[PDB]
C-alpha cells in the first residue's frame, strides 16, 4: 500500500503512557488517521507507538 510521513512542528512531552513524545522536526509515521483529533503514530524503525495531537504535525 502506502502510509504518511509527518514532521513535528512543536515539541510534545506526554505524561500519559498512551502518548508518544517528540521534538520539533522529528519524523513520525501515521498509522491511524482518526480525524478525531488524536492520531496514532510510531517512531521510525522503532516499536515506540502512541497517540499524538493532530495539530502538532504537517505532512512532509
Residues 6+ apart with CB under 8 A from 58: 6, 7, 9
Residues 6+ apart with CB under 8 A from 6: 27, 28, 29, 30, 41, 57, 58, 59, 60
Within a 10 A sphere around the Cβ of 50, how many other Cβ atoms?
19
User: 17 is written with which cell numbers?
Assistant: 503512557
Pairing mode, if any, of strands 27-32 and 49-53?
A: unpaired
Within a 10 A sphere around the Cβ of 36, how many other Cβ atoms?
8
Count of structural domains, the chain: 1
Domain that holds residue 50: 4-59
Pairing mode, if any, of strands 38-43 and 49-53?
A: antiparallel
Q: What is the CATH number of the domain that holds 30?
A: 2.30.30.40
Residue by residue, what is the 3-state secondary structure of 1-60?
A: CCCEEEEECCCECCCCCCECCECCCCEEEEEECCCCCEEEEEECCCCCEEEEEHHHEEEC
Q: How far apart are CA 53 and CA 45, in angstroms?
A: 21
User: 22 is written with which cell numbers?
Assistant: 517528540
Experimental method: X-ray
Amino acid at each position: 500500500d502506502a502510509r504518511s510521513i509527518v514532521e513535528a512542528m512543536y515539541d510534545y512531552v506526554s505524561e500519559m503512557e498512551t502518548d508518544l513524545s517528540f521534538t520539533k522536526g522529528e519524523a513520525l509515521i501515521i498509522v491511524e488517521n482518526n480525524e478525531g483529533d488524536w492520531w496514532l503514530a510510531r517512531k521510525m524503525n522503532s516499536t515506540e507507538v502512541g497517540y499524538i495531537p493532530s495539530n502538532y504535525v504537517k505532512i512532509r
